[PDB]
Amino acid sequence: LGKLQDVVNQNAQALNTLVKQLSSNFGAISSVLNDILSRLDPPEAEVQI
Amino acid sequence: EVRQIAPGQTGKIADYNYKLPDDFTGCVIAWNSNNLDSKVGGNYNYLYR
Protein backbone atom coordinates (compact mmCIF):
# COMPACT_ATOMS: atom_id res chain seq x y z
CA LEU A 1 0.00 0.00 0.00
CA GLY A 2 2.97 2.31 -0.40
CA LYS A 3 1.51 3.90 -3.51
CA LEU A 4 -1.32 5.29 -1.37
CA GLN A 5 0.08 5.40 2.11
CA ASP A 6 2.50 7.75 0.38
CA VAL A 7 -0.37 9.91 -0.80
CA VAL A 8 -1.81 10.27 2.65
CA ASN A 9 1.75 10.75 3.87
CA GLN A 10 2.46 13.61 1.52
CA ASN A 11 -0.84 15.15 2.51
CA ALA A 12 -0.28 14.88 6.22
CA GLN A 13 3.35 15.86 6.43
CA ALA A 14 2.47 18.77 4.18
CA LEU A 15 -0.14 19.96 6.64
CA ASN A 16 2.36 19.27 9.37
CA THR A 17 5.07 21.52 8.04
CA LEU A 18 2.34 24.00 7.26
CA VAL A 19 1.43 24.51 10.88
CA LYS A 20 4.99 24.00 12.01
CA GLN A 21 5.92 27.14 10.14
CA LEU A 22 4.44 29.18 12.93
CA SER A 23 7.49 28.21 14.91
CA SER A 24 9.44 30.28 12.40
CA ASN A 25 9.58 33.77 13.88
CA PHE A 26 11.53 35.27 10.98
CA GLY A 27 13.82 37.33 13.13
CA ALA A 28 11.01 38.72 15.20
CA ILE A 29 11.29 38.55 18.91
CA SER A 30 8.47 36.02 19.01
CA SER A 31 6.54 33.43 17.04
CA VAL A 32 3.17 34.41 18.51
CA LEU A 33 2.03 37.73 17.09
CA ASN A 34 0.20 38.29 20.35
CA ASP A 35 3.46 38.01 22.27
CA ILE A 36 5.34 40.49 20.12
CA LEU A 37 2.64 43.13 19.96
CA SER A 38 2.57 42.82 23.72
CA ARG A 39 6.35 43.16 23.54
CA LEU A 40 6.45 46.59 21.89
CA ASP A 41 4.66 49.87 21.60
CA PRO A 42 2.46 50.23 18.48
CA PRO A 43 4.83 51.83 15.95
CA GLU A 44 7.83 49.53 15.60
CA ALA A 45 5.63 46.55 16.32
CA GLU A 46 3.75 47.60 13.19
CA VAL A 47 6.55 46.81 10.75
CA GLN A 48 7.53 43.93 12.98
CA ILE A 49 4.08 42.40 12.58
CA GLU B 1 10.24 68.42 25.74
CA VAL B 2 9.86 68.89 21.97
CA ARG B 3 12.31 66.24 20.83
CA GLN B 4 9.86 63.37 21.35
CA ILE B 5 7.00 64.96 19.39
CA ALA B 6 6.92 62.76 16.31
CA PRO B 7 4.60 60.25 14.59
CA GLY B 8 4.70 57.11 16.65
CA GLN B 9 7.45 58.64 18.80
CA THR B 10 6.42 58.36 22.43
CA GLY B 11 6.51 60.82 25.31
CA LYS B 12 4.07 61.45 28.16
CA ILE B 13 3.10 64.66 26.38
CA ALA B 14 2.29 62.48 23.40
CA ASP B 15 0.91 59.95 25.87
CA TYR B 16 -1.58 62.16 27.63
CA ASN B 17 -1.04 65.87 27.14
CA TYR B 18 -0.71 66.29 23.40
CA LYS B 19 -2.08 64.24 20.51
CA LEU B 20 0.07 62.41 17.98
CA PRO B 21 -1.24 60.07 15.24
CA ASP B 22 1.19 57.61 13.69
CA ASP B 23 -0.14 57.76 10.12
CA PHE B 24 0.07 60.34 7.31
CA THR B 25 1.10 63.76 8.63
CA GLY B 26 2.51 67.11 7.51
CA CYS B 27 5.43 67.66 9.89
CA VAL B 28 6.70 68.97 13.20
CA ILE B 29 8.68 72.22 13.05
CA ALA B 30 10.10 74.28 15.90
CA TRP B 31 12.47 77.10 16.81
CA ASN B 32 13.52 78.52 20.13
CA SER B 33 11.33 81.02 21.97
CA ASN B 34 13.93 83.57 23.04
CA ASN B 35 10.87 85.85 23.11
CA LEU B 36 10.09 84.32 26.54
CA ASP B 37 12.29 85.61 29.35
CA SER B 38 9.54 86.39 31.84
CA LYS B 39 10.50 83.74 34.39
CA VAL B 40 7.20 84.03 36.27
CA GLY B 41 4.87 86.02 34.03
CA GLY B 42 3.00 86.71 37.27
CA ASN B 43 1.09 83.54 36.46
CA TYR B 44 1.22 79.76 36.15
CA ASN B 45 1.27 80.09 32.35
CA TYR B 46 1.45 76.47 31.17
CA LEU B 47 -0.24 73.10 31.42
CA TYR B 48 1.71 69.95 30.58
CA ARG B 49 2.49 66.59 32.23
C-alpha closest to that of A22 among A32, A12, A9: A32
C-alpha closest to that of A41 among B5, B4, B8: B8
What is the C-alpha to C-alpha distance for residues B20 and A48, in angstroms, rounded to an integer?
21
Residue of A nearest to B8 (CA): A43
Q: Would you tell me how many other CB atoms lie within 10 Å of the CB of residue B32?
A: 7
DSSP states of chain A as a string? -HHHHHHHHHHHHHHHHHHHGGG--TTSS-SSHHHHHTTS-HHHHHHH-
- Give the per-residue SS3 of B11-46: CHHHHHHCCCCCCCCCCCCCCCCCCCCCCCCCCCCC
Resolution (A): 4.7
Task: Count Cβ–Cβ pairs < 8 Å, chain A vs chain B.
Answer: 11
Method: cryo-EM
CB B11 within 8 A of CB B4: yes
What is the C-alpha to C-alpha distance for residues B38 and B15, in angstroms, rounded to an integer?
28
The strand pairing partners of B6, in sequence order, are B9
What is the C-alpha to C-alpha distance for residues A44 and B12, in angstroms, rounded to an integer?
18
Residue B14 CB-density burial (10 A; 0-12 exposed, 13-18 middle, 19+ buried): middle
**B6 to chain A, minimum CA–CA distance in Å?**
11
Chain B residues within 8 angstroms (CB to CB) of chain A: 7-10, 22
